[PDB]
Design a protein around this ligand. Structure first.
Ligand SMILES: Cc1cc2nc3c(=O)[nH]c(=O)nc-3n(C[C@H](O)[C@H](O)[C@H](O)COP(=O)(O)OP(=O)(O)OC[C@H]3O[C@@H](n4cnc5c(N)ncnc54)[C@H](O)[C@@H]3O)c2cc1C
Ligand SMILES: Cc1cc2nc3c(=O)[nH]c(=O)nc-3n(C[C@H](O)[C@H](O)[C@H](O)COP(=O)(O)OP(=O)(O)OC[C@H]3O[C@@H](n4cnc5c(N)ncnc54)[C@H](O)[C@@H]3O)c2cc1C
Ligand SMILES: CCOCc1nc2c(N)nc3ccccc3c2[nH]1
Ligand SMILES: CCOCc1nc2c(N)nc3ccccc3c2[nH]1
Ligand SMILES: CCOCc1nc2c(N)nc3ccccc3c2[nH]1
Ligand SMILES: CCOCc1nc2c(N)nc3ccccc3c2[nH]1
Ligand SMILES: [Zn+2]
Ligand SMILES: [Zn+2]
Lengths: 228, 228
């Protein structure tokens, strides 16, 4: 009995992202998986890292250091309930899927805020306690990304460079850092300019992959994998 | 007579980031430059890309497309005043400095929100009108970033990889994409770990650099610069 968390960052349910989220819920639900979706825009998730994220007495209330105070708050069980609720979902999940459109070679800010605020020290990593020793070891993560740019644009000789170049901060710097094993990304290139037929194929391809997702091995989340 | 915008993303004015911000304002003010600072946390800048960013009625209110609607809103002069206020500051600036702590190999979410919402189609880029032909072409941009990790950890052979790897989505995918010429990053490594005197050295180096900032050549913002 596998538990999946989908962290979803799109404003419109009828979007191509909305369709990819829905196809994931349907397929994983049909398999008998336990599925939870954090729909960040519908939640109006707070993206800003502020002192409101700590509900206890600050370690140093004169000079506010977000990393220090959230770490201490996590240990004192005194983080904001929105953070606490996301952490519970992550803690229960065997797989965390991130579904989002690429914004400036990265995640939309609302999803960046999820990362910034949820993956706090003591919960997702410690020092020491990162990369292969990260605290979310034993979990899988998968980026399901849609782009404006075509696949040709995301090659070493295209204007945007290899897609693996933009994956590094997310897959390695964030997910691997917290101990996740990373499944190969699902990149759906340029749905806005693809044909109706081609769009259905990309949605179908995602649905089909998910049928066998539990038998995939993660990528080796290495510099070598990303950069050759 | 040069104009500088500092986009600043730190919660605490007594922080090392706060100090680097103040040194920049002091030095550029002393030179006679026109200086403006967008203090994103003090402004409580909205980071989420939503339909509240378009004033009045939408192009397609049935199916919301953030990209399409903000492009149209830019042409119709119906973007939210927080966005248009930032665009005015960027339009006038000859140099834009971003001052921030590294969050998950990237910018803090509030600054990511600035990038997502301010740099809209029609203002920062168009088709055609990207990379060297971006709509902000000729302007200079500079990332002044502080890290938790030390310089020796941000090497090709270290666990984190070269610091240049994480600069790619920001310098290339964002700044170069909009036509900015990118000055070399100012990376202030591990101020929390560094000695008092080391920190003073890092502040003094930034102050020194700013004295001759207008004499600098930009970097070749290429895949080879970042990964070669
Ligand atoms: C602020 C910002 C920054 C950006 N930065 C970047 C960047 O750095 N790099 C980059 O490449 N791109 C970038 N983009 C572009 C962005 O990544 C794309 O616009 C996005 O990925 C498109 O996904 P979508 O779900 O919005 O597409 P949609 O517009 O929702 O999808 C296109 C069409 O597919 C249709 N569709 C939906 N479901 C289905 C289905 N089941 N079957 C068939 N058709 C369907 C929809 O009706 C729609 O008409 C950026 C966009 C913004 C707003
Ligand atoms: C959500 C999150 C994600 C992060 N992700 C990453 C990551 O991916 N990679 C990474 O490397 N790091 C990461 N970090 C760590 C973060 O980058 C550092 O904590 C940050 O850059 C430190 O900068 P600061 O300004 O907060 O330092 P501060 O703690 O404000 O400064 C350190 C010391 O400098 C002192 N100081 C201030 N001004 C001066 C002055 N003029 N002269 C001398 N001393 C002075 C202060 O008093 C303080 O003692 C992350 C942190 C968070 C919260
Ligand atoms: C009345 C039908 O409205 C469109 C819709 N289709 C789906 C779906 N296949 N799957 C879904 C899974 C989770 C949440 C929503 C959906 C969904 N919504
Ligand atoms: C026979 C109808 O086939 C299409 C289909 N629609 C949905 C749906 N709205 N929601 C679903 C939720 C869970 C699992 C499957 C679906 C689903 N399947
Ligand atoms: C025409 C409607 O606009 C969609 C779009 N926005 C972006 C962007 N900021 N950046 C991009 C970078 C590379 C390729 C495509 C994009 C892109 N596409
Ligand atoms: C220690 C291993 O590599 C460098 C590094 N230092 C920090 C830090 N002080 N704090 C962090 C907070 C969140 C995410 C990463 C870091 C981080 N990364
Ligand atoms: Zn890795
Ligand atoms: Zn470039």
């Amino acid at each position: 009995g596998k538990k999946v968390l989908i962290v979803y960052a799109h404003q419109e349910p009828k979007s191509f992202n909305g369709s990819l989220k829905n196809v994931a819920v349907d397929e994983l639900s049909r398999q008998g998986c336990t599925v939870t979706v954090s729909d960040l825009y519908a939640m109006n998730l707070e993206p800003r890292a502020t002192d409101k994220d700590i509900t206890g007495t600050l370690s140093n209330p004169e000079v506010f250091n977000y990393g220090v105070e959230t770490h201490e708050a996590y240990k004192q069980r005194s983080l904001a309930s929105d953070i606490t609720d996301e952490q519970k979902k992550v803690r229960e999940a065997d797989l965390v899927i991130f579904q989002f459109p690429l914004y400036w070679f990265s995640v939309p800010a609302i999803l960046k805020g999820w990362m910034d605020r949820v993956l706090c020290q003591g919960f997702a990593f410690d020092i020491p306690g990162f990369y292969d020793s990260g605290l979310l070891q034993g979990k899988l993560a998968l980026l399901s990304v849609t782009t404006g740019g075509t696949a040709e644009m995301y090659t070493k000789t295209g204007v945007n460079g290899d897609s693996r170049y933009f994956l590094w901060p997310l897959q390695h710097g964030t997910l691997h850092f917290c101990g996740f094993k990373v499944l190969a990304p699902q990149i759906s290139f340029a749905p806005e300019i693809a044909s109706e037929e081609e769009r259905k194929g990309m949605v179908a391809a995602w649905s089909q992959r998910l049928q066998t997702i539990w038998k995939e091995e993660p990528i080796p989340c290495t510099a070598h994998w990303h950069f050759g």
